[PDB]
Amino acid sequence: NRPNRLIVDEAINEDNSVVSLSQPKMDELQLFRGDTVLLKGKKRREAVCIVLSDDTCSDEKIRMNRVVRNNLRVRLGDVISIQPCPDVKYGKRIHVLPIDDTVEGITGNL
Amino acid sequence: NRPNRLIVDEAINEDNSVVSLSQPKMDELQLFRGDTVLLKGKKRREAVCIVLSDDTCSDEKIRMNRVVRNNLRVRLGDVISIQPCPDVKYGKRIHVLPIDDTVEGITGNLFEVYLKPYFLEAYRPIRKGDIFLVRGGMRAVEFKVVETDPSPYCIVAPDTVIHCEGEPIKREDEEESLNEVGYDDIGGCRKQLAQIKEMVELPLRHPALFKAIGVKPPRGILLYGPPGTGKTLIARAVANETGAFFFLINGPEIMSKLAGESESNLRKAFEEAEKNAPAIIFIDELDAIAPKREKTHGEVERRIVSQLLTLMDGLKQRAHVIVMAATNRPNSIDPALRRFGRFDREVDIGIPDATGRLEILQIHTKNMKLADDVDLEQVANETHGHVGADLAALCSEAALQAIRKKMDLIDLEDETIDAEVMNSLAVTMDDFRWALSQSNPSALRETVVEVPQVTWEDIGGLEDVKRELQELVQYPVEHPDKFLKFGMTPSKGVLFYGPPGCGKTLLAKAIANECQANFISIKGPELLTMWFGESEANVREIFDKARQAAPCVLFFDELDSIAKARGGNIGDGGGAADRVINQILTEMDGMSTKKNVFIIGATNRPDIIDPAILRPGRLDQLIYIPLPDEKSRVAILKANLRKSPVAKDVDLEFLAKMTNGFSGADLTEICQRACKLAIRESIESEIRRERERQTNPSAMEVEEDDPVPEIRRDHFEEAMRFARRSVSDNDIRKYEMFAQTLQQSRGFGSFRF
Amino acid sequence: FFLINGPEIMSKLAGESESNLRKAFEEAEKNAPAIIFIDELDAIAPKREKTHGEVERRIVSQLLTLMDGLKQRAHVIVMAATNRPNSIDPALRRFGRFDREVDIGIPDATGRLEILQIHTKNMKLADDVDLEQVA
Numbered sequence: 001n002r003p004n005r006l007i008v009d010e011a012i013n014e015d016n017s018v019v020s021l022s023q024p025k026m027d028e029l030q031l032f033r034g035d036t037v038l039l040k041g042k043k044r045r046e047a048v049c050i051v052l053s054d055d056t057c058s059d060e061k062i063r064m065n066r067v068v069r070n071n072l073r074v075r076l077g078d079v080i081s082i083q084p085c086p087d088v089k090y091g092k093r094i095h096v097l098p099i100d101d102t103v104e105g106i107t108g109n110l
Numbered sequence: 111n112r113p114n115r116l117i118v119d120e121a122i123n124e125d126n127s128v129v130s131l132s133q134p135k136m137d138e139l140q141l142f143r144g145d146t147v148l149l150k151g152k153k154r155r156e157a158v159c160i161v162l163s164d165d166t167c168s169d170e171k172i173r174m175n176r177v178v179r180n181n182l183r184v185r186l187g188d189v190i191s192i193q194p195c196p197d198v199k200y201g202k203r204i205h206v207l208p209i210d211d212t213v214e215g216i217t218g219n220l221f222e223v224y225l226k227p228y229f230l231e232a233y234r235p236i237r238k239g240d241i242f243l244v245r246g247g248m249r250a251v252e253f254k255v256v257e258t259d260p261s262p263y264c265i266v267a268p269d270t271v272i273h274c275e276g277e278p279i280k281r282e283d284e285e286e287s288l289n290e291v292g293y294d295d296i297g298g299c300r301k302q303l304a305q306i307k308e309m310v311e312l313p314l315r316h317p318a319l320f321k322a323i324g325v326k327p328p329r330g331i332l333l334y335g336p337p338g339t340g341k342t343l344i345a346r347a348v349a350n351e352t353g354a355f356f357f358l359i360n361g362p363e364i365m366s367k368l369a370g371e372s373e374s375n376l377r378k379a380f381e382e383a384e385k386n387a388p389a390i391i392f393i394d395e396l397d398a399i400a401p402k403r404e405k406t407h408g409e410v411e412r413r414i415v416s417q418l419l420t421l422m423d424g425l426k427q428r429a430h431v432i433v434m435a436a437t438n439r440p441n442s443i444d445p446a447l448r449r450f451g452r453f454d455r456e457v458d459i460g461i462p463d464a465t466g467r468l469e470i471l472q473i474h475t476k477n478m479k480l481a482d483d484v485d486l487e488q489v490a491n492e493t494h495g496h497v498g499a500d501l502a503a504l505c506s507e508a509a510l511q512a513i514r515k516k517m518d519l520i521d522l523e524d525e526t527i528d529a530e531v532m533n534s535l536a537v538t539m540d541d542f543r544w545a546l547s548q549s550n551p552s553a554l555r556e557t558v559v560e561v562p563q564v565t566w567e568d569i570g571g572l573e574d575v576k577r578e579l580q581e582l583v584q585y586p587v588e589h590p591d592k593f594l595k596f597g598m599t600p601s602k603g604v605l606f607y608g609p610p611g612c613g614k615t616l617l618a619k620a621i622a623n624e625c626q627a628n629f630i631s632i633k634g635p636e637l638l639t640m641w642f643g644e645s646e647a648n649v650r651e652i653f654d655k656a657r658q659a660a661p662c663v664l665f666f667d668e669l670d671s672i673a674k675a676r677g678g679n680i681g682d683g684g685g686a687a688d689r690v691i692n693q694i695l696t697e698m699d700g701m702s703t704k705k706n707v708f709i710i711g712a713t714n715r716p717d718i719i720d721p722a723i724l725r726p727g728r729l730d731q732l733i734y735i736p737l738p739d740e741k742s743r744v745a746i747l748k749a750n751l752r753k754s755p756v757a758k759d760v761d762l763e764f765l766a767k768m769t770n771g772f773s774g775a776d777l778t779e780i781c782q783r784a785c786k787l788a789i790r791e792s793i794e795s796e797i798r799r800e801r802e803r804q805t806n807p808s809a810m811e812v813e814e815d816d817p818v819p820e821i822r823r824d825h826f827e828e829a830m831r832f833a834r835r836s837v838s839d840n841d842i843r844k845y846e847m848f849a850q851t852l853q854q855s856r857g858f859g860s861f862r863f
Numbered sequence: 864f865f866l867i868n869g870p871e872i873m874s875k876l877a878g879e880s881e882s883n884l885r886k887a888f889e890e891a892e893k894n895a896p897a898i899i900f901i902d903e904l905d906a907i908a909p910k911r912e913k914t915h916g917e918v919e920r921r922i923v924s925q926l927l928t929l930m931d932g933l934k935q936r937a938h939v940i941v942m943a944a945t946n947r948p949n950s951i952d953p954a955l956r957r958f959g960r961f962d963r964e965v966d967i968g969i970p971d972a973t974g975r976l977e978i979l980q981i982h983t984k985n986m987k988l989a990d991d992v993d994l995e996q997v998a
Contacts, residue, residue, distance in 0.1 A: 083525055360924070362920070363920055363924060366916060366917060
């Protein structure tokens, strides 16, 4: 990518929870309704939020959401480029373990 | 083997696993359908191959295919017949373990794809390197290990599934076997390996060769390998060729504070290895591991010696076990030199070679390196001044550093692997050499003036001397056969007795430049000591280095001053000097090794030389050096200037005319002074500092010329007026005149019949 | 992932410490495990620094074997302060660091300023804290 780095400011949308998917995500890539722009993270972390977006209504060039930035731990102004990632695996069935901290300290059956 | 060489031609069948048998094997191998035709091959080879022999048409050549040689691990022309399957042992629970390569790439589970071939017949070649054709699955269901777990054809019907081990092991045994050191990895010493291995095998293959001969195999001998010889490579090669449990035993590791604890541990290890297998013990650092309890009063050392004489010299304590004593140096007079019981028998084993440095470098480059641009001539030139496994490590380091420089010069290339950068990563001979110079020690790089690019370039002239030295070198280099035909041996050294410091050191440098190895610079100062033992030590070091390397010019300073033809001076000094003179004569005489050696004595006073040394053979060539000449001075000054500087204003003819035959050392001093004056007067040293980027970066918009331009005749004249150039003409003239008068008194007539 | 560790539960591990270390060194040579930093690396491996007997020399020799017996896939070797500075383990004496040094940055005002910034982010030092003065 580019050799000079920059910093990403706040999202253009006023609402943090309103993270509109970019038009380029559905244009360059076949972004379906059930998938969004998958964010890459550190130590093999990846998260995608299922949100319906309308690329034909308004292509808002807003920055990442505060919750999205905190969850993905995305650096400020990091070059968002698609490169070869050979460290991604896949599975069929998993066990969604609950948070142990929420179980303890809650009155009654947490 | 047989005296008729087997013709290694193309096999009749295209497939490597299928070969055509010879005339005698056309009907010798019975074709049975219910019983697999297991051909008796190498390394317990029980292969169910076809009996397809092309001998019914013509005499099929007895030769393996391209992959069959690596598959069967059998030599060309080896006799292979249809015999009982030795690799196929039927047992109570004989199941073949699976491997990751058998699991990876195959559809479904490894057991699921294997049971199709594990039910009655595999219908595939179960061997390492063989062309294994597996019908169906589009994959090879076989263990990526040395061989099958239970057997090649075990007793396992379809009701007995292949019970795999706890984990699928793949690409592990093959990696070790590739890493197993081939005996050829060391040039010349592979003869030693063959000698020892044949001693083991033939005495075992032929018990007549051991008992009926009456000579048993030797328990062990001192390793004729110098320090850092990579004797670990020797042990690895022994283990790879001769299958045994290598027992590396570091001498330092055998040093313990508790008396006997190291000895008891060593005895326990020896016993454990003996009970383990016909193993091989590697006594690392064995030469310094003990003082033989003679030089040292250490009771621990005595106990270690006793344990060795008990453990190493044990009653049949080597059940086909090899006590390989890894001596620190091949010639180190070690404890076992004092106690020749560990080497109670030294095997006649062919020692290493000289291009084995170049050969090992070529092997390392051919091992996995893709340095195509690395010139083999540069490799040979480096191997001329290099080491054994140490030089191989230096080559590996140079390759790694050049590859790092190239890869760092490239980006991460995460998207796609750059085939040109990665594959065929031709590390340039320049790149590899620079990486080596950055990696390998730089002390030996400038020490050999063969690296210094002055073939009498620093001192123009001495063409007769240069020619004589070149002829002497090329004699047992170019036409040693001519020397044998004449039957004349070379001379010892040259007594270049001329002006002091006129370039005698430069003379030695030029000689080394003509040479390929290093030299031996000595001074009379090192000879003096309060206790008279320095001369023997110096002579021993000189002999060992000459015994070690090629002719090292014994550039001895104050040689005449040290010797002074004995004379018999008073005091302890006179007797010590006489003893030193006798020791020097003994070093220059006696049952010498007749190895490559050269002598360069510094004698500013020929009258102060030794009378005994003056004898031919004691100094051999007593070629008294001349003094500098005006034309010679002009040539030397021109060459010295031509090295660094270019000057048009300062005329070389004017410099020569002003020189009037000044001293060659004085000429070099004048050149250095003019160079310093030019460097100080340099605009980059003067003008750039003057402006210092105040209004302009330098005091001039354009840079000045080369520093020599223009250090005119004024700067040189000022230096010369400051310079002495004051050699004692009368004294040197008298010395040369006396030498010439002696030489004239020494000459004779033609006396030709 | 994969190849978590050996059992290594005897709490004594006389020769077992060497055995598990050799097993981990050999296992990573054909696997893709992470470089898990050795806890108490100097304590478990005296590295010719603790005793003039056998434990420290054995630790040094095992380090040399592991550095000369592991492929470039995990390289679980402690850096900087691996063993004691006086006698570090032979992981650098064997293959891996025998020809290259470490481009360590000297202790300058940059490190002090970065530490001060980290501390200020962690806790409120002062309203007018002179981080330049501290550096």
